[PDB]
Structure 1
Amino acid sequence: MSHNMKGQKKRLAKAHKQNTRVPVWVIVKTNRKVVSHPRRRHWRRRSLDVK
């Protein structure tokens, strides 16, 4: 099941945390000028090269 070390799991946790919708108050404050970031992906697509 892909036995991982500590560092690999750490990087996987970070790449997980980056999949987030931009906060609503950011969109309110910037006046609909920020609506996305380049860190969004999906698990069944291009594999991440984190490991």
Structure 2
Amino acid sequence: MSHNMKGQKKRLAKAHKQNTRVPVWVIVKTNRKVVSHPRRRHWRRRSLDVK
């Protein structure tokens, strides 16, 4: 239970909501040309450089 300030937790929240798959409708719209993005990660890996 490390203790974050408001901004550190906001940056963690942004990192968390960035770690989502591309929407299926985006894949349909681009005709399978956009299927991923570079901000995918896993929590148990090389950590965030955010906080």
Q: Percent identity of the aligned residues?
A: 100
Q: Shift of the alpha carbon at 1:31?
A: 0.5
Aligned partners of 1:29 and 1:14: how far apart in 2? 25
Please report the TM-score for the alignment, with normalisation by the length of structure 1.
0.95
Cα deviations by residue, 1:7-44 (Å, 9 ceiling, x for unpaired): 00000000000011100111001000000000000011
Runs of 4+ residues over 6 Å off in structure 1: none
If the length of structure 2 is used for normalisation, what is the TM-score?
0.95
Mind listing any 5+ residue stretches in structure 2 that lack a counterpart?
none
- Stretches of structure 1 that go unaligned for 5 or more consecutive residues are none
